[PDB]
């Protein structure tokens with residue numbers, strides 16, 4: 001312990017040196033990272049929710065690169081000839097309206113005058129005059145066509161002068177007369193405006209303005225948010241615009257300013273606890289420098305080219321965690337002052353470094369275990385947050401004690417009395433009433449296990465939408481109110497299976513960014529023209545005709561080629577189905593040419609693919625399409641059954657094939673299903689890794705076995721109760737939720753670690769004295785840490801984005817649950833049956 005004495009002497013005797021050096025280095029790294037790496041573009045929020053590296057992901061990447069290589073460039077070419085030498089539509093912007101006093105049908109006069117007022121309110125907005133999409137060049141901003149407008153249109157007069165009880169009732173008699181006289185397009189248009197349940201009492205109406213859906217009309221959206229259109233009787237409840245991602249970005253960038261408020265509150269907490277402004281200032285600086293160093297190591301050093309939006313969530317975490325190691329430090333420091341600076345620094349560092357290290361290690365280990373996932377955004381988030389935590393810990397060790405020593409170089413009643421009363425009440429409660437808390441929190445643990453595991457588990461998302469905004473946001477309300485209207489159904493597109501042979505199922509790209517798919521490799525053992533290959537391809541088609549999932553051209557080209565052979569002469573003419581391979585390769589491109597030269601020209605993925613090696617071409621690949629009876633569903637079990645069945649049958653069929661064609665693989669629109677499977681598997685893996693990290697850290701630092709078991713129990717019950725609370729709040733499995741379930745461990749184990757470490761650290765080995773010592777020393781820092789984290793999240797609750805709200809719920813829930821379990825369940829366990837006299841000590 002001689003070298004560490006020198007480090008403590010440096011921190012105590014020359015702190016300005018460490019401060020200046022850290023500041024210079026971190027500011028330089030920030031300068032480099034922000035100047036050299038161009039800034040993150042969140043133009044598309046659903047970027048990196050794909051599972052690169054898996055079987056399905058490999059196949060999908062290969063299939064994508066194939067289409068990327070079909071026609072625009074590359075030796076491949078589908079056709080060898082290319083190788084040789086007014087009424088509305090959905091794209092307009094539309095508002096969905098409902099009536100909210102009487103709450104009767106919208107249709108009658110009062111609703112129509114309300115919609116007149118709505119239209120006059122919308123069109124009075126200034127920017128609308130620029131976006132109006134004027135037509136006819138008559139110096140007119142064209143009017144929005146809706147219910148009252150059409151009611152006036154059937155009449156000769158204009159709108160808002162309806163005289164409805166004779167006029168609107170005539171419009172009613174018109175609609176009841178006809179169903180699907182067709183004056184201009186009134187019936188068809190108006191039956192597309194209103195909902196299914198119009199035949200009387202349309203639950204919802206819709207207003208169409210002459211404005212295309214674009215990314216440009218965001219100030220229009222904000223101007224409409226100013227005047228909320230709720231005037232007396234009607235409510236604009238779902239305004240669809242092609243504006244989800246732009247508003248998502250803008251709201252992220254505003255809600256980080258809102259994160260600044262939680263940062264301010266955490267700084268206020270540090271000021272109240274410590275009693276100086278210098279330490280809170282330098283802790284803010286430490287949080288910022290940790291973020292900067294992490295962004296530098298992420299972008300510049302590690303060359304991670306993709307920065308998700310989820311990485312910003314790490315900021316919301318670290319403002320909670322970064323100040324925590326402050327509260328633990330100065331406490332011990334003040335204790336050492338009660339019982340020059342070099343010795344004090346040595347003692348408080350020997351007492352605090354274990355706990356600080358342990359907390360940051362558990363959090364960073366969970367975050368880095370998130371890198372085990374196949375999804376890319378999870379990998380990026382894991383690496384970023386782990387780097388942020390590790391930077392925060394190094395910043396703690398170096399920059400915090402120097403700031404402490406500088407504070408002492410620089411150098412309340414109600415606060416002390418309140419903290420004393422709080423400590424006294426908590427201590428007396430735990431010591432007197434222990435079995436009560438043990439029973440209560442064990443019951444809650446069992447209930448939460450039943451909730452999280454058996455019946456209402458973390459069910460997968462089945463109507464995904466990759467939701468972004470709050471449920472009571474118009475862009476998200478509209479997605480629920482789509483199906484009620486007519487022009488939202490295309491009936492359903494059946495799924496179409498592809499079988500590909502020429503190319504390998506490999507992803508030779510960087511799995512971290514979604515814009516490096518790599519280069520496809522062609523299988524060189526691939527020979528279609530062989531006679532056994534012809535026989536097997538024919539039997540394959542005719543076998544697909546047998547199987548149940550089949551549903552009924554370019555696909556199964558071999559049939560069209562046999563037809564091209566069947567035609568009598570007057571080379572390719574007057575042949576049979578089994579014929580010579582050079583005749584095959586010479587006549588097949590001619591068959592495709594004559595089939596495309598037909599005026600049908602069915603453009604599809606199906607067919608063979610040729611390359612230059614008339615000149616003799618060679619087939620590098622083919623894809624065989626078949627329409628399947630299964631419809632495109634979002635749920636997991638249907639596509640699981642479909643994919644498993646078809647893959648099993650195909651892999652059984654391939655064994656019949658020669659070794660030439662034994663390189664084929666299956667594909668469909670299996671992106672979301674692949675995500676769904678990998679998400680559960682990777683969540684389990686990340687939970688296992690983080691749990692192992694926490695268990696190891698426990699066994700090393702709180703060397704006793706019983707304390708480790710009690711801590712594992714407390715953490716497991718805390719995570720159970722948290723996940724259960726989230727489920728009852730309406731949480732389903734998703735990327736953020738898998739992340740949060742993996743990181744709840746490393747967030748929650750901190751409190752248990754503090755208590756177990758200080759319990760081992762007690763001089764008196766009796767459980768009673770050890771518990772008193774533990775509580776008296778460490779009750780305050782845990783409280784202020786949990787408070788800072790929960791407060792940082794609970795301000796994010798006041799946001800319109802779902803990620804930030806979800807983090808608010810998660811941080812608040814985890815911190816409160818973990819504190820109440822570790823403080824009452826674990827300490828009661830130690831008070832009643834804790835280890836004394838070194839029982840079960842390593």
Ligand SMILES: CC(C)CCC[C@@H](C)[C@H]1CC[C@H]2[C@@H]3CC=C4C[C@@H](OC(=O)CCC(=O)O)CC[C@]4(C)[C@H]3CC[C@]12C
Pocket residue numbers: 010018021022025398
């Ligand atoms: C930049 C990041 C990696 C954080 C680490 C900070 C280092 C740059 C600090 C930590 C220990 C510091 C050293 C601790 C003490 C000394 C002894 C000192 O020697 C003297 O005796 C001059 C003063 C005198 O004699 O009064 C020269 C600087 C040096 C090596 C300091 C140089 C800078 C060091 C390596």
Ligand SMILES: CC(C)CCC[C@@H](C)[C@H]1CC[C@H]2[C@@H]3CC=C4C[C@@H](OC(=O)CCC(=O)O)CC[C@]4(C)[C@H]3CC[C@]12C
Pocket residue numbers: 253254256257259260263288315
């Ligand atoms: C330590 C924690 C609190 C993270 C805070 C990081 C800040 C340095 C970032 C967060 C949001 C950023 C702002 C988000 C967007 C803009 C608009 C930008 O001007 C533009 O018109 C182009 C960008 C756009 O319009 O999206 C000028 C800087 C500014 C205010 C950025 C300034 C720096 C801010 C405050």
Ligand SMILES: CC(C)CCC[C@@H](C)[C@H]1CC[C@H]2[C@@H]3CC=C4C[C@@H](OC(=O)CCC(=O)O)CC[C@]4(C)[C@H]3CC[C@]12C
Pocket residue numbers: 039040041042253287288289291292295
């Ligand atoms: C001050 C210390 C704690 C450093 C903290 C890092 C932040 C200053 C960085 C991290 C990610 C950066 C963002 C990643 C990039 C964007 C998008 C950009 O908006 C645009 O759409 C313009 C670019 C384009 O459209 O081409 C506005 C800045 C912003 C939010 C950057 C603002 C500053 C952020 C929050």
Ligand SMILES: CC(C)CCC[C@@H](C)[C@H]1CC[C@H]2[C@@H]3CC=C4C[C@@H](OC(=O)CCC(=O)O)CC[C@]4(C)[C@H]3CC[C@]12C
Pocket residue numbers: 361364365368369371372373689693
């Ligand atoms: C430094 C502190 C925070 C402790 C944590 C160390 C991490 C850097 C370790 C812990 C678990 C390690 C992971 C455990 C296993 C895997 C899977 C591996 O991918 C594979 O698919 C091949 C191995 C397999 O069969 O799983 C990639 C590395 C990775 C994530 C390891 C990367 C580094 C991790 C995140």
Ligand SMILES: CC(C)CCC[C@@H](C)[C@H]1CC[C@H]2[C@@H]3CC=C4C[C@@H](OC(=O)CCC(=O)O)CC[C@]4(C)[C@H]3CC[C@]12C
Pocket residue numbers: 425426428429820
């Ligand atoms: C939220 C649920 C899961 C339990 C945790 C909430 C605590 C703030 C409560 C629970 C029981 C409360 C205790 C129940 C009764 C008393 C006796 C009381 O004794 C007195 O000296 C004055 C009043 C009296 O008891 O006569 C001191 C506070 C205390 C231990 C209370 C302190 C705060 C406790 C630990």
Ligand SMILES: CC(C)CCC[C@@H](C)[C@H]1CC[C@H]2[C@@H]3CC=C4C[C@@H](OC(=O)CCC(=O)O)CC[C@]4(C)[C@H]3CC[C@]12C
Pocket residue numbers: 444445447448451724725728729730
């Ligand atoms: C072991 C089991 C019984 C877990 C017990 C934990 C309780 C403290 C949780 C379980 C369900 C939670 C409730 C679930 C949902 C809500 C609604 C919430 O108000 C809202 O309007 C927002 C809800 C949303 O939008 O999802 C107020 C809190 C409350 C009652 C929560 C309060 C705390 C409750 C009772």
Ligand SMILES: CC(C)CCC[C@@H](C)[C@H]1CC[C@H]2[C@@H]3CC=C4C[C@@H](OC(=O)CCC(=O)O)CC[C@]4(C)[C@H]3CC[C@]12C
Pocket residue numbers: 443446447450455456727728729730731
């Ligand atoms: C202490 C030992 C004896 C274990 C006791 C376990 C009970 C506390 C479990 C068993 C059946 C459970 C219930 C089974 C299922 C439901 C439905 C559930 O309703 C919902 O719709 C919430 C889901 C959502 O909104 O996402 C509310 C919880 C509840 C009654 C569970 C509450 C807790 C119960 C009573």
Ligand SMILES: CC(C)CCC[C@@H](C)[C@H]1CC[C@H]2[C@@H]3CC=C4C[C@@H](OC(=O)CCC(=O)O)CC[C@]4(C)[C@H]3CC[C@]12C
Pocket residue numbers: 786787790791794795797798799812815816
């Ligand atoms: C004891 C420690 C762990 C702190 C946790 C206390 C919670 C009960 C507090 C913390 C912040 C509070 C939140 C801060 C502000 C808001 C916004 C409020 O709704 C608004 O949108 C009004 C503000 C706006 O204009 O956006 C709903 C309650 C809520 C989430 C509060 C609910 C309760 C929260 C989560």
Ligand SMILES: CC(C)CCC[C@@H](C)[C@H]1CC[C@H]2[C@@H]3CC=C4C[C@@H](OC(=O)CCC(=O)O)CC[C@]4(C)[C@H]3CC[C@]12C
Pocket residue numbers: 470721725729797805809812813816817820821
């Ligand atoms: C170990 C035992 C004592 C568990 C107790 C934990 C509570 C402090 C947690 C459980 C559920 C939490 C609540 C879950 C969510 C809500 C709703 C939130 O307001 C919202 O509108 C969010 C809903 C949305 O925007 O979608 C205000 C905070 C609150 C009551 C949270 C406050 C703190 C609660 C009551």
Ligand SMILES: *[C@@H]1O[C@H](CO)[C@@H](O[C@@H]2O[C@H](CO)[C@@H](O)[C@H](O)[C@H]2NC(C)=O)[C@H](O)[C@H]1NC(C)=O
Pocket residue numbers: 527528529530580581582618
């Ligand atoms: C696929 O395999 C067949 C036989 O295994 C190859 O056919 C022969 O080689 C040349 C090709 O022009 C010709 O002599 C005959 O067509 C075949 N040889 C015989 C019958 O002895 C065929 O070339 C292979 N495909 C490719 C693209 O090379």
Ligand SMILES: *[C@@H]1O[C@H](CO)[C@@H](O)[C@H](O)[C@H]1NC(C)=O
Pocket residue numbers: 153154155156
């Ligand atoms: C105007 O009124 C006449 C007489 O009822 C009717 O035939 C005509 O269709 C009306 N005009 C419009 C645009 O509906």
